[PDB]
Design a protein around this ligand. Sequence first.
Ligand SMILES: CCCCCCCCCCCCCC(=O)O
Lengths: 45, 45, 45, 45, 45
Amino acid sequence: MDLAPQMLRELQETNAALQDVRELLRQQVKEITFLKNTVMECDAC
Amino acid sequence: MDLAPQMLRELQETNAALQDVRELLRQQVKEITFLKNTVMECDAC
Amino acid sequence: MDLAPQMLRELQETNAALQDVRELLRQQVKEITFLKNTVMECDAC
Amino acid sequence: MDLAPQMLRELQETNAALQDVRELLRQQVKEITFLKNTVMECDAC
Amino acid sequence: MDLAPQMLRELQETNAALQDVRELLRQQVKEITFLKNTVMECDAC
Ligand SMILES: CCCCCCCCCCCCCC(=O)O
């Protein structure tokens, strides 16, 4: 129906891109939390 | 009418992921801030 | 019934969450820049 | 009532917010990269 | 005035910027990971 089909595909791609960003961020948070504890447990500090 | 139901669904899933990203970012800045504070008080520095 | 009003609401909710994300990120960069400068002045280094 | 005009405005606001998010992420990655290298050449390591 | 064409262009712009955000995030996670590992093999601690 006109551009509706095209718009729906764009929305689907956005949702897919979002899922990946979500996974990346969840991975980044773990690394950051790890870094935090590591420096937090540094003897020289 | 039209692909309205389909489009709405994609928007709903996107918002669900976006709300998750916001909370993830919320937690991350908190960890980063604690990491910053720890380094600021690091005697080695 | 008509789903247009509901679609508009979803879009409005997206922008609200996206705005919070922009604000958090803005703060995070500031925190990361502070962390960087602190490390640059860390004597042990 | 045609909600297309209002929907368009929301989509436009979304892109404006995304542009700010991308610009912020660009500067953030630069700060983190600089932090990485600074720790790499840190004497006490 | 039909706004569908313009709305489609907005959706495409959203996916373009999001892909940029994703590319930057995956690079950043790599930089953060490098930072994490460098701190782990840092003698000072
Ligand atoms: C309608 C599309 C939804 C908007 C997409 C949201 C993009 C947010 C990316 C978050 C960036 C994370 C930055 C960070 O803390 O490292």
